[PDB]
């Protein structure tokens, strides 16, 4: 099971200097372990780290593979990464269609660990993405519910739509992950839920990576999804 991660992303001000809780989730699906989880996964990259083995000149990142509970899934997170002394965009299509990318080709592309990390591979674990390429299966996408930073909601609600017109005309399965529930806003998990009552089949899974609250039964969910329309 391929599954990409997928949200608002792009650069500070269109993120309100607070990205919707993609690496997290996934950091905390993959390796749920306190010590293995990071709150902080900074998109703010030097030309060196972006070059580097793990980001492999994308604007994605393989988190690795589960095998936990048997189904064994891939984990890709779609995101945009900006240059720390431009603060633009990295020169690598525009997000919502790189990240409706169902094809993933990036040759010796090394498992992220943590911003540590970057450019500094040889001092971790080095384990590659299967034979370099990923057909995606599923989407999770991703949409946060906190107040997050006085982030413009609607705005973020906008640019999900779009997006998931995108991942839409795949038909491949689709499932929204509310996050940082911990910190929701109801007006705003009402709205998510409103958005998704609109499409087919859409289901929500409700988590916290923070706290850890639902995250593998957000997996699980899309796995089910993907086995329902594989058969
Ligand atoms: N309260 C709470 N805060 C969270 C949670 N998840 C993430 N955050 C905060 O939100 C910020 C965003 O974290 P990320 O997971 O990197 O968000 P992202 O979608 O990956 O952002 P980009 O990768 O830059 O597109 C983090 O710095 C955390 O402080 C959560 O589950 N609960
Ligand atoms: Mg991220």
């Given at each position: 099971?391929?599954?990409?991660?997928?949200?608002?992303?792009?650069?500070?001000?269109?993120?309100?200097?607070?990205?919707?809780?993609k690496?997290?989730?996934?950091?905390?699906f993959?390796?749920?372990?306190?010590?293995?989880?990071?709150?902080?996964?900074?998109?703010?990259?030097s030309?060196?780290?972006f070059?580097?083995?793990?980001?492999?000149n994308?604007?994605?990142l393989?988190?690795?593979?589960?095998?936990?509970?048997?189904?064994?899934?891939?984990?890709?997170?779609?995101?945009?990464?900006?240059?720390?002394?431009?603060?633009?965009?990295?020169?690598?299509?525009?997000?919502?269609?790189?990240?409706?990318?169902?094809?993933?080709?990036?040759?010796?592309?090394?498992?992220y660990?943590?911003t540590?990390?970057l450019?500094?591979?040889?001092?971790?674990?080095?384990?590659?993405?299967?034979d370099g390429?990923?057909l995606?299966?599923?989407?999770?996408?991703?949409?946060?519910?906190?107040?997050?930073?006085?982030?413009?909601?609607?705005?973020?609600?906008?640019?999900?739509?779009?997006?998931?017109?995108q991942?839409?005309?795949?038909?491949?399965?689709?499932?929204?992950?509310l996050?940082?529930?911990?910190?929701?806003?109801?007006?705003?998990?009402?709205?998510a839920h409103?958005?998704?009552?609109?499409?087919?089949?859409?289901?929500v899974?409700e988590?916290?990576?923070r706290?850890?609250?639902?995250?593998?039964?957000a997996?699980?969910?899309?796995?089910?999804?993907?086995?329902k329309?594989?058969?």
């Amino acid at each position: 099971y391929n599954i990409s991660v997928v949200g608002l992303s792009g650069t500070e001000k269109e993120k309100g200097q607070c990205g919707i809780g993609k690496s997290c989730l996934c950091n905390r699906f993959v390796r749920p372990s306190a010590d293995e989880f990071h709150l902080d996964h900074t998109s703010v990259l030097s030309t060196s780290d972006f070059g580097g083995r793990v980001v492999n000149n994308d604007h994605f990142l393989y988190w690795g593979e589960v095998s936990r509970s048997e189904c064994k899934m891939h984990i890709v997170e779609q995101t945009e990464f900006i240059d720390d002394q431009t603060f633009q965009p990295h020169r690598s299509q525009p997000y919502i269609k790189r990240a409706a990318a169902t094809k993933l080709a990036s040759a010796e592309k090394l498992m992220y660990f943590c911003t540590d990390q970057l450019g500094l591979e040889q001092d971790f674990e080095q384990k590659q993405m299967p034979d370099g390429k990923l057909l995606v299966d599923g989407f999770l996408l991703g949409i946060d519910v906190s107040r997050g930073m006085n982030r413009n909601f609607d705005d973020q609600l906008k640019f999900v739509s779009n997006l998931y017109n995108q991942l839409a005309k795949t038909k491949k399965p689709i499932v929204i992950v509310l996050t940082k529930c911990d910190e929701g806003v109801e007006r705003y998990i009402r709205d998510a839920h409103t958005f998704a009552l609109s499409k087919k089949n859409l289901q929500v899974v409700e988590t916290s990576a923070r706290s850890n609250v639902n995250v593998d039964l957000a997996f699980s969910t899309l796995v089910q999804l993907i086995d329902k329309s594989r058969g």
